[PDB]
Design an enzyme around this catalytic site. Structure first.
Site, PDB file in Angstrom:
ATOM      1  N   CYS A   1      -1.978 -46.036 -63.579  1.00 43.80           N
ATOM      2  CA  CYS A   1      -2.180 -47.252 -64.347  1.00 43.80           C
ATOM      3  C   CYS A   1      -3.326 -48.079 -63.773  1.00 43.80           C
ATOM      4  O   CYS A   1      -3.513 -48.136 -62.560  1.00 43.80           O
ATOM      5  CB  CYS A   1      -0.932 -48.119 -64.378  1.00 43.80           C
ATOM      6  SG  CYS A   1       0.508 -47.200 -64.944  1.00 43.80           S
TER       7      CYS A   1
ATOM      8  N   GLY B   1       1.199 -44.030 -60.880  1.00 49.32           N
ATOM      9  CA  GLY B   1       0.249 -44.790 -60.092  1.00 49.32           C
ATOM     10  C   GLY B   1      -1.152 -44.812 -60.711  1.00 49.32           C
ATOM     11  O   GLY B   1      -2.027 -45.518 -60.194  1.00 49.32           O
TER      12      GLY B   1
ATOM     13  N   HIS C   1       2.046 -55.094 -66.217  1.00 51.92           N
ATOM     14  CA  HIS C   1       3.314 -54.546 -65.770  1.00 51.92           C
ATOM     15  C   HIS C   1       3.346 -54.405 -64.244  1.00 51.92           C
ATOM     16  O   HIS C   1       4.345 -53.964 -63.688  1.00 51.92           O
ATOM     17  CB  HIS C   1       3.659 -53.260 -66.539  1.00 51.92           C
ATOM     18  CG  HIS C   1       2.888 -52.029 -66.187  1.00 51.92           C
ATOM     19  ND1 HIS C   1       2.089 -51.372 -67.094  1.00 51.92           N
ATOM     20  CD2 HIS C   1       2.876 -51.279 -65.084  1.00 51.92           C
ATOM     21  CE1 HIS C   1       1.577 -50.287 -66.522  1.00 51.92           C
ATOM     22  NE2 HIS C   1       2.026 -50.223 -65.291  1.00 51.92           N
TER      23      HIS C   1
HETATM   24  O1  LIG Z   1       0.305 -42.026 -67.051  1.00 51.33           O
HETATM   25  C1  LIG Z   1       1.314 -42.181 -66.302  1.00 51.33           C
HETATM   26  C2  LIG Z   1       1.487 -43.546 -65.832  1.00 51.33           C
HETATM   27  C3  LIG Z   1       2.844 -43.638 -65.154  1.00 51.33           C
HETATM   28  C4  LIG Z   1       3.665 -44.505 -66.021  1.00 51.33           C
HETATM   29  O2  LIG Z   1       3.805 -44.130 -67.195  1.00 51.33           O
HETATM   30  N1  LIG Z   1       4.313 -45.643 -65.568  1.00 51.33           N
HETATM   31  C5  LIG Z   1       4.249 -46.225 -64.178  1.00 51.33           C
HETATM   32  C6  LIG Z   1       5.302 -47.332 -63.953  1.00 51.33           C
HETATM   33  N2  LIG Z   1       5.340 -48.325 -65.119  1.00 51.33           N
HETATM   34  C7  LIG Z   1       6.690 -48.953 -65.181  1.00 51.33           C
HETATM   35  C8  LIG Z   1       7.004 -49.794 -63.914  1.00 51.33           C
HETATM   36  C9  LIG Z   1       6.292 -50.989 -63.666  1.00 51.33           C
HETATM   37  C10 LIG Z   1       6.608 -51.790 -62.477  1.00 51.33           C
HETATM   38  C11 LIG Z   1       7.627 -51.373 -61.606  1.00 51.33           C
HETATM   39  C12 LIG Z   1       8.356 -50.152 -61.881  1.00 51.33           C
HETATM   40  C13 LIG Z   1       8.058 -49.394 -63.017  1.00 51.33           C
HETATM   41  C14 LIG Z   1       4.745 -47.799 -66.441  1.00 51.33           C
HETATM   42  C15 LIG Z   1       5.271 -48.414 -67.789  1.00 51.33           C
HETATM   43  C16 LIG Z   1       4.443 -49.379 -68.489  1.00 51.33           C
HETATM   44  C17 LIG Z   1       4.858 -49.930 -69.686  1.00 51.33           C
HETATM   45  C18 LIG Z   1       6.128 -49.514 -70.250  1.00 51.33           C
HETATM   46  C19 LIG Z   1       6.928 -48.570 -69.608  1.00 51.33           C
HETATM   47  C20 LIG Z   1       6.492 -47.996 -68.361  1.00 51.33           C
HETATM   48  C21 LIG Z   1       5.091 -46.352 -66.468  1.00 51.33           C
HETATM   49  C22 LIG Z   1       3.373 -42.188 -65.042  1.00 51.33           C
HETATM   50  C23 LIG Z   1       4.606 -41.651 -64.376  1.00 51.33           C
HETATM   51  C24 LIG Z   1       4.859 -40.278 -64.420  1.00 51.33           C
HETATM   52  C25 LIG Z   1       3.937 -39.378 -65.097  1.00 51.33           C
HETATM   53  C26 LIG Z   1       2.788 -39.877 -65.730  1.00 51.33           C
HETATM   54  C27 LIG Z   1       2.493 -41.321 -65.705  1.00 51.33           C
END
Ligand SMILES: O=C1C[C@@H](C(=O)N2CCN(Cc3ccccc3)[C@H](c3ccccc3)C2)c2ccccc21
Ligand SMILES: O=C1C[C@@H](C(=O)N2CCN(Cc3ccccc3)[C@H](c3ccccc3)C2)c2ccccc21
Lengths: 301, 305
Positions: free
Chosen positions: A145, A143, A41
C-alpha cells in the site's frame, strides 16, 4: 527492433518513497515538496477495517503519532489532513529529491509504470493498464500500500495511481493522488466485487501496428470493414467499442505502416473469429491490450 | 497476489548513464568512479563497420577526441584504453552518483534488468533473460548501444550486460563489462549465426510454482514422472535437460507449495504433449521461461533494494 512491456525509469519516484508508521500500521508514503501522501487506512487498526470511521480516527490522532522515515532519517510532522482516501502529512523539510511533477487522473485504457515498494523501499518496476472495470492486474503483497503508478514526460513525473487494496479476486484497486478511488471501490473490508473486465480495442490495434513494424505480418488480410460492422464484432467478443477518437489516435501508426485503420480492424475481426491458430504475435499467443498508441510510438522513437 | 515481469528499480543505474561522442558517432556510456565504459564501435565509421581494424582505428584517436557529457556537463578524459570490445575512458572526476557495484558474467538462463538509453538519457526498463544461445530478446533502437543490464542485491549493482548490436534476425548481442561477447558474436556488420535456441526448463518450472502460488492450479496433474523420462520429453520439445542441480534450486519452491519437483515435471510434460488448450497460466497462453527460481521467490517474498 523488438517489442517489450517497458516501464519508465523509476529513479525520480524512488527518491520520493518513504515509510509511514502510525500505531502498528506501516505502509509507503510519497514525499513531494514538504508533503507526504499515503493511504488513509494507515491510521486504522485491524478491528476498524471492517467498518472504519475515518473521521473519528483522524481527530483521535496527533502530529506526533505519525512516524515518517525517508531511508534512515526521521521527518518531523508539522500537520496532518485528510482528502478523500489519502492522508497528507506536512513535514518540516522539503524533499531535496522532489522532481517536477503533476497529479493526473487517467482514463480506463491508459498505461503507467508501478514502483512496488515495502517499508518505504522499492522492490521493482512493471508496466500496467487501468482496466475498463477500473482495476489493475498488478503484483503486490502485504505492505505494498502507498506504492504509486506514474508516467514520465521528459523530466516531469505525472503521478496517476496510489495502491490501496487487493480484492478477493486477486486484482488491485486504488486511488488518484487526490485520494479518489478508480472505480466504485471503498477502503473497507466489505463484499465489493469488480465488474466484468473488457479488452481495450484501441490498444490491441496499436499492438498490431507494432507487430507490423517489427516484421510480424501474417495476420494481415485483404479484407476491409466498417466501424459499425467492426463494433458489432467487438461487442460479441467483449471488446470496448472503437470510436472515431480511437481511429484518429491510430493515424500516426496508420501513416507509418501504410495500413489504413479499417483494414487493420478487418485483420483484428478475423483474428477474433478465427483465433490465433497456434501462431504468435510479438511472442504472444494472445492479443495484448496493455500498450497504448502512445506507448507503441514512444517505443519505436 | 499477481505475478508480473518485474524489473529492478533503475535509479542507481540512471545516475551512471552518460553520452559518449567520438567523431560523429554518439552512444551511451556507463560512468563509475573515474572510468567511463562504452562499446568500442564508438570509434568506427559506417564504412569501417564491415571489417573494422579496431587497433588501427583507436590509434588515430586521442583522449581529447572523446567527448563525455554527463547530463549537460562535459567530463575531461585523462587516458583511454581498449579492453576486448569495450573502451574505458579515464575521466577527470569520480562520478558522485557511483553506487556500490560489481562486474559479473551471467550464465545462460539467468535474468537481468535492461535500462534502455539514448544520448545518455534513460528511456525505459524491462526484465529479460540471457537465452541459451547467448542472445537476448530486447527492445533497442539506433543509439541504444552501451545500454546496460544489471541485477541488484540490497545496495550492490551487478552489471552483467552492455548492448552492442542487433543481429539481422532482430535479436540482440552484447558483452559483459570487460568487453567479452556473450556467445560467438563479433562487433562487425556481418551476418552471424545465433545457434538454435532452447527453452530454459528450470525457469518454466519456477514459473509453474509461481502460478500455483497465485491460485492457477488447473495444470496440476495426478501423474508423476522420472528425471530421465521427463528429459526425453524435454529434448523432443527443445527444452534444456533438467539436472539434479535444477531440482535442488527448485527445493524452496517445492517446500512452499508442497509439490514435489517430479510432480511439477509431470504437469509440464502434459502441457508440452497436449498444449495449453485455450486456457491461460498467469495471463499467458505460452510457457514462460524468463523467470528464475530466485526471481519467483523475490517477487513472492517482496525483497527491497
Ligand atoms: O495489494 C495488497 C495490499 C495488502 C492489502 O490488501 N491490505 C493491507 C492491510 N490493509 C488493512 C489494514 C489496515 C491497517 C491495519 C491493519 C489492516 C488493506 C485494506 C485497505 C482497505 C480495505 C481493506 C483492507 C489491505 C495485501 C495483503 C495480502 C496480499 C496482497 C495485498
Ligand atoms: O539494437 C540496435 C542498436 C543499433 C545497432 O545495431 N547499431 C548502431 C551502430 N553500430 C555500427 C556503427 C558504429 C559507428 C558508426 C556507424 C555505425 C552497431 C554495430 C555494432 C557492431 C557490428 C555492427 C553494427 C549497429 C540499431 C539500429 C537500428 C535498429 C536497431 C538497433
Amino acid at each position: 527492433s523488438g517489442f517489450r512491456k517497458m516501464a519508465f525509469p523509476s529513479g525520480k519516484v524512488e527518491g520520493c518513497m518513504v515509510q509511514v508508521t502510525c500505531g502498528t500500521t506501516t505502509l509507503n508514503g510519497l514525499w513531494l515538496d514538504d508533503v507526504v501522501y499515503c493511504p488513509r487506512h494507515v491510521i486504522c487498526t485491524s478491528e476498524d477495517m471492517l467498518n472504519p470511521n475515518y473521521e473519528d480516527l483522524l481527530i483521535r490522532k496527533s502530529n506526533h503519532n505519525f512516524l515518517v522515515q525517508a531511508g534512515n532519517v526521521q521527518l518531523r510532522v508539522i500537520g496532518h489532513s485528510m482528502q478523500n482516501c489519502v492522508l497528507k502529512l506536512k513535514v518540516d523539510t522539503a524533499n531535496p529529491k522532489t522532481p517536477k511533477y503533476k497529479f493526473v487522473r487517467i482514463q480506463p485504457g491508459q498505461t503507467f509504470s508501478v514502483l512496488a515498494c515495502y517499508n518505504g523501499s522499492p522492490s521493482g518496476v512493471y508496466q500496467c493498464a487501468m482496466r475498463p472495470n477500473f482495476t489493475i492486474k498488478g503484483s503486490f503483497l502485504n505492505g505494498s500500500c502507498g506504492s504509486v503508478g506514474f508516467n514520465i514526460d521528459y523530466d516531469c513525473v505525472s503521478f496517476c495511481y496510489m495502491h490501496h487494496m487487493e480484492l478477493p479476486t486477486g486484482v488491485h484497486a486504488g486511488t488518484d493522488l487526490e485520494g479518489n478511488f478508480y472505480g466504485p471501490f471503498v477502503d473497507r473490508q466489505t463484499a465489493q466485487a469488480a465488474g466484468t473486465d473488457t479488452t481495450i480495442t484501441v490498444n490491441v490495434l496499436a499492438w498490431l501496428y507494432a507487430a507490423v513494424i517489427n516484421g510480424d505480418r501474417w495476420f494481415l488480410n485483404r479484407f476491409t470493414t466498417t466501424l459499425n460492422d467492426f463494433n458489432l464484432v467487438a461487442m460479441k467478443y467483449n471488446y470496448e467499442p472503437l470510436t472515431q477518437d480511437h481511429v484518429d489516435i491510430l493515424g500516426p501508426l496508420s501513416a507509418q505502416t501504410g495500413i489504413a485503420v479499417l483494414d487493420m480492424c478487418a485483420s483484428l475481426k478475423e483474428l477474433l473469429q478465427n483465433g490465433m491458430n497456434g501462431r504468435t504475435i510479438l511472442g504472444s499467443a494472445l492479443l495484448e491490450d496493455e500498450f497504448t498508441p502512445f506507448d507503441v510510438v514512444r517505443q519505436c522513437s
